[PDB]
Design a protein around this nucleic acid. Structure first.
Ligand SMILES: [Mg+2]
Ligand SMILES: [Mg+2]
Ligand SMILES: [Mg+2]
Lengths: 83, 185, 222, 141
RNA sequence: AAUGAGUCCACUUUAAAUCCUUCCGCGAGGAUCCAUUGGAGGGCAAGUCUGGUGCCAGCAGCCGCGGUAAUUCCAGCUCCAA
RNA sequence: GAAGCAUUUACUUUGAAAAAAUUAGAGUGUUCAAAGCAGGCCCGAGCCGCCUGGAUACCGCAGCUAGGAAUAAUGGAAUAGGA
RNA sequence: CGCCGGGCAGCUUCCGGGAAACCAAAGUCUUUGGGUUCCGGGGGGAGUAUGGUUGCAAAGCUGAAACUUAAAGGAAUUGACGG
């Protein structure tokens, strides 16, 4: 990508895992992308927005997708920070 | 003991695999479409291109602003431009790496004679050269593989002695005319 | 006439998603070949690498089946390689073509150096393994062509890679393994991570939620 | 594993030549027993004199009589057996003729179903065997 | 219509010649002024065409071919490679 | 600037010296090329001749030379016979 | 009932590897370099002949070549057969 003239020479830009920062390939059918709903501060109703996490198949096969999603949710202000 | 030189080299290389269908088809297309004699002429042209590409690769691996890179790259680019296989706008070694042997085969004298309208049908252009009808600027050339430079391009013409430029018609026309006038009054 | 039974096939047939790259981007499984010849129609070429007559022994002699190796692809960055075995050859070739369409993958291309024009070679050196076969693809300058055996040459020409040094190891007379190893290296082009891909990704909506209203009205079930 | 030390060139080189003696081709080329054993003595062809015409039975599963000659070489006068290749070429060779003899293709190895024959006849007395077979020339009579 | 390859006068060449080069005069219609070596099962481009032979004669680097319908021998024809 | 280096080496960079030919490579229409080292420009003619080349690189290890000083080896005060 | 260290092992695992059987080492290997010793190079002939050397002997150690051959092997699969 980015030949010297400046344009982008790529079919597409693949996703990176949000836990291990690895490329999620086009034939990785164990890799999820999950949106987590946000709520407003006053009444806790779903306000139409969400935060998105992608996990590659290797992390999700290690058994570490649970802790990774929990840490990402800590980092994004989802639920507790003191759980 | 002797004042000889003995310095010589081959000008071609044979392909590694004989009887490859795709390669056979491609070089037959080149032979038929450019009117060559054998596979050896195709191999000679692609050997020439391969040596140019080897020089260009070795210069490209060197550092920019190296004096040797500047000197030999400029000389190589000037040479390829003066024989017309590379344009003046494309004056970098990458465009040297973009060349193909259909660019070199176009610069032969046979191809130029056919494409200048000076002879139809590239096979007729070969036999016209080999029978000494054609001259670059004033020199009579019978070499179908003469590589025509850009400067000596406007000066391809019939030679002054052939019966397509000046006079003196050939032995067949002279023979037919003299037997006709011997048979007539 | 194509009547799809898949959410992805329903979205593809109704022109809701175009340009197969986002199907790759969200890494979804393609389970209908009609999607592939919908997007890459009139550019896919297929060729038979090998027909091998496999056999198993029964008490009334051998039962001979036929295995077909078909490589497919447009010459601009997609290949697949399918393999099917059948009692007769034409059925095996048909099934191998369908399987090759289903297993199609995008090919990343790069520059040898001085990134001037279109990308022409592999972006780095990649290696695929299958059985004992190890195939190594190496970036080559422009006009080099493909320096390979005929089988990875066929696969790499269908990938749209113009210039590639190669290297092999193992029993390469096991053409199935050797084709599969070339296909493996080709797919791990986009498996690979390069400094120009370090930029943080931005998550767009998956096609399953972008058109969930279309899918609830038209796909299920009516 | 192998030693990788910066000052280990002697160990590496000595090991390599000691282990180079362990392949068949290097030992065959560099020992001199093979050069002494073969009748040509490193030459590509040799001249000899036919002692008798023999037929060797082909190895199984083939079944034929391969027409050979028994030849005694002029230098170092060993006795070899040479094939006479083509459909009728044995009738050209008469007893006590003087042939040229070449290798038979596999560098001192037997070829085909012919058991133990490493040589073929080229040019029975000086007219070549191919020209005799093709009718180009005839025996110098 | 065009041309050499040859035959050959002269120049030139050279110590003297020869060869090339230059140039008179002759020199092509099966332009008989005649392209050959290897091959045609696979590896490996190219025939399951025909006649003969019948585990013989032979081919075949290697797998193999041949026991009276040989895609492989011996030939003709036709193709392939340089 | 005369003298010396507060260790000595390895290493690295530079500079000298490594025959020519061969190889790489610049220039040059041998009629093209393999080659060669040659050539090119005006003559309306005195022109009682003018211009230009015959480059450059590479040449292991050992030896010589001048900068660097990380890495690796090594050395100085313990019976103080120390600065 | 636990924790730490060093042991002999076991189960399980898409760590990764491997031709596979399998292996937490047989992993961290074409993305190939932590240190080092011994050792293989198609099958036979042959661990034979010969020389040397050790031993009371039996034998041990070191150790060819001529010649011969297109496979000999490994691991898995399907059948067939199994007193
Ligand atoms: Mg180790
Ligand atoms: Mg025939
Ligand atoms: Mg052995």
């Amino acid at each position: 990508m980015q030949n010297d003239a400046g344009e982008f020479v790529d079919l597409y830009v693949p996703r990176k895992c949000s836990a291990s920062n690895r490329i999620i390939g086009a034939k990785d059918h164990a890799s999820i992308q999950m949106n987590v709903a946000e709520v407003d501060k006053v009444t806790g109703r779903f306000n139409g927005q969400f935060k998105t996490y992608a996990i590659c198949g290797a992390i999700r096969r290690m058994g570490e997708s649970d802790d990774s999603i929990l840490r990402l949710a800590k980092a994004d202000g989802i639920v507790s920070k003191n759980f | 003991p002797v004042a000889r030189s003995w310095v010589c080299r081959k000008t071609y290389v044979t392909p590694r695999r004989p009887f490859e269908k795709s390669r056979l088809d491609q070089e037959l297309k080149l032979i038929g479409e450019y009117g060559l004699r054998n596979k050896r002429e195709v191999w000679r042209v692609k050997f020439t291109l391969a040596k140019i590409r080897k020089a260009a690769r070795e210069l490209l691996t060197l550092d920019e602003k190296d004096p040797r890179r500047l000197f030999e790259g400029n000389a190589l680019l000037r040479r390829l431009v003066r024989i017309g296989v590379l344009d003046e706008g494309k004056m970098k070694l990458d465009y040297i790496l973009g060349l193909k042997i259909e660019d070199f085969l176009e610069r032969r004298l046979q191809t130029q004679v056919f494409k200048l309208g000076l002879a139809k049908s590239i096979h007729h252009a070969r036999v016209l050269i080999r029978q000494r009808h054609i001259r670059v600027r004033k020199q009579v050339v019978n070499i179908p593989s003469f590589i025509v430079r850009l400067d000596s391009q406007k000066h391809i013409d019939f030679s002054l002695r052939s019966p397509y430029g000046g006079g003196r018609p050939g032995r067949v026309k002279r023979k037919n005319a003299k037997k006709g006038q011997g048979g007539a009054g | 006439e194509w009547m799809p039974v898949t959410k992805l096939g329903r979205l593809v047939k109704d022109m809701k998603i175009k340009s197969l790259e986002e199907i790759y981007l969200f890494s979804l499984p393609i389970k209908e070949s009609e999607i592939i010849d919908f997007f890459l129609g009139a550019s896919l070429k297929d060729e038979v690498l090998k027909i091998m007559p496999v056999q198993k022994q029964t008490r009334a002699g051998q039962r001979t089946r036929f295995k077909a190796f078909v490589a497919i692809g447009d010459y601009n960055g997609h290949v697949g390689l399918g393999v099917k075995c059948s009692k007769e050859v034409a059925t095996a070739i048909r099934g191998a073509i369908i399987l090759a369409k289903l297993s199609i993958v995008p090919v990343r291309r790069g520059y040898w150096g001085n990134k001037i024009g279109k990308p022409h070679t592999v972006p780095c050196k990649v290696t695929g393994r299958c059985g004992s076969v190890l195939v190594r693809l190496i970036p080559a300058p422009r006009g080099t062509g493909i320096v390979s055996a005929p089988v990875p040459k066929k696969l790499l020409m269908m990938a749209g890679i113009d210039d590639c040094y190669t290297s092999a190891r193992g029993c390469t007379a096991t053409l199935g393994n050797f084709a599969k190893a070339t296909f493996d290296a080709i797919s791990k082009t986009y498996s690979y991570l390069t400094p120009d891909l370090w930029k943080e990704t931005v998550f767009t909506k998956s096609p399953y939620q972008e058109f969930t209203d279309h899918l609830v009205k038209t796909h299920t079930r009516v | 594993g192998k030693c990788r030390g910066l000052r280990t060139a002697r160990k590496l080189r000595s090991h390599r030549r000691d282990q180079k003696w362990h392949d068949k081709q290097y030992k065959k080329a560099h020992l001199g027993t093979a050069l002494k054993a073969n009748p040509f003595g490193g030459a590509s062809h040799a001249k000899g004199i036919v002692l008798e015409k023999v037929g060797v039975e082909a190895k199984q599963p083939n079944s034929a009589i391969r027409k050979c000659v028994r030849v005694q070489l002029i230098k170092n006068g060993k006795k070899i057996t040479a094939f006479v290749p083509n459909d009728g070429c044995l009738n050209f060779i008469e007893e006590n003729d003087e042939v040229l003899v070449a290798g038979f293709g596999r560098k001192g190895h037997a070829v085909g179903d012919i058991p133990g024959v490493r040589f073929k006849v080229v040019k029975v007395a000086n007219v070549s065997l191919l020209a005799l077979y093709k009718g180009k020339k005839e025996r110098p009579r």
